[PDB]
C-alpha cells in the first residue's frame, strides 16, 4: 500500500474574482480534465476538476456579499468512469450545487438543470449559465459539488468538489484562529490502480448475469484515504490554535475521527453555522456532506506527530495500516507571531430562541423495491425521483419533518436551501413496523448532542430510529430537492423534489 505520511496536504488557493465592485462579485469556474499526482509513489491521475484542479479552488465570500459563478463544463464528451445507462441526451451532464447555500432554486444546481459541454444542451430545469448567490445567511462553511442527474457519484467520484467559506463581520470579535491558520480540510476516499488511474466499480462483485454492465454498487468504500487530494498527507503545524473545517466529500464513507495523542477536538462550528456553545470532544462522527468546524489546539504538543486517526468501517472494519488513518500534524513550523486566537465558549445565539409556529409535521420513510435485475433501488417514501411531488410546504412557515429508518444503516439526509434543528432521536421496533406499518418505539426520545444544538443541513438518520427535525422554508420559494448524501443511493433513486410553495 502507499507509504502513509508522505507528501505535504495542499492548501487550496482562493479564487480571485474576474470581476468585483461594491456591488458585485464574478466569478468564472470551468470544468476541466486534468492530470495530478495523488501521492509521491504514483505517476500522475486523470481527473475532472474544477478550474482543472483537484479539489476545485476555495472561494471565500462575506455574508451578504452579492456573488455570480459562471459554472462552466469544458470536460470531454465522453466520460472516463463507467456509467450505467439502465438506471434513468449527452453523456456527460454536470451542474453545481453550493451544498449549504441559501440559493434562489435555478442557482441551486437542480438535477434535472445540467448542461453539457459550452451549454449546448441543457436539462428541462436549466434556465440560467450564471449562478446568484446572494449569502444572506449565517457565516458558515459550505462546499461545491457537482449534482447531475444519475450521474452524481461519478462526477464527484472523479474530483468535482470544492470548498466554500461564508465570513460574517460580526463574528471576527470572537477572536477564532484565522488567515494561514484556517484550514480546510477536504476528506475523500479513493481507490487508485497501479498506473495511478482512478478506480471505480463496474458493477457489485458476485455480479449476477442478471445484471446489467456496467451496473450501479449500492455502495464505494475506497481503499486509501485522501485530504485536499492528496493521500494520507502530513501537515506541518506552528504550537498554537488553529481552526479546521472539515468537509466529507467522500461518495459513502462515514468517518469517526480521533487523535492518536488523545488530544480534544473544540467544535466550533455545524454545517449551518456556528454553535452556540463550543463543545470540547474526544471523537466525531463525519457522514457525506457534513461539516465540522473545529479548533485543534497544538500549543501543548510542540515536536509531535499526531495522527487524525477513524474509527468507522466501511464494508468491514477499519484497517489500522490504511483507512484508520486520515493524516498526519507535525507541530514544527516556528511560531510567525503570538498566538492572539481564541477558543472562546460563548459563541452564538441558541436556535431554540426562535419560537416558531408548527404549520405542518411530515412522515417519511426510507425504503426501497427490487429492479428487474435483482438490484436495490432506494427511494424515499417509495415515490421515484420521477414521481409527482409531495414535499410542498408552504413558504416561511415551519415543519417537523419525521424521519423513519427501517433499514440496516445510517443514511445522510440533506435539505437543500435550508439549515434546520435537530430535536431528537427515538428507536422503534423494525419487524413490527415493516409487517404492519405501526410504528411503536422502544425506548424514550434522546434529544441532540451537543454537537447538533445549531443548524444542521445534512444529519445522520441512524437504523432503527425515527429522526425529528424543524425547519423554516424560506426565505425563497421554488423547487428544490431533499435526498440521502449517500452518493451510489441518491443516484438510484433516493432524492425527491421539494416544491416551497407560494
Ligand atoms: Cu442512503
Redesign the pocket.
Known sequence: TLEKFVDALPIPDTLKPVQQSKEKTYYEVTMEECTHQLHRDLPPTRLWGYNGLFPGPTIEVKRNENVYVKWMNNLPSTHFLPIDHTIHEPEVKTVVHLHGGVTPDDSDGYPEAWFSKDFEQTGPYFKREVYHYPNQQRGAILWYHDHAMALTRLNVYAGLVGAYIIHDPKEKRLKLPSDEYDVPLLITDRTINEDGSLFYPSAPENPSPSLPNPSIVPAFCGETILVNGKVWPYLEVEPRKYRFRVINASNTRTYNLSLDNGGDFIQIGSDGGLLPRSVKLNSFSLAPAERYDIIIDFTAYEGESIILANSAGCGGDVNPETDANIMQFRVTKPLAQKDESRKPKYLASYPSVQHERIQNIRTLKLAGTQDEYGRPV?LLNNKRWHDPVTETPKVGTTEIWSIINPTRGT?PIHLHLVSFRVLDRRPFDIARYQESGELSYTGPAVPPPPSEKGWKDTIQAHAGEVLRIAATFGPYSGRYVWH?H?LE?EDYD?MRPMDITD
Do not use: E, T, W
Open positions: 432506494l443514511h440521502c449517500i443511493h433516493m
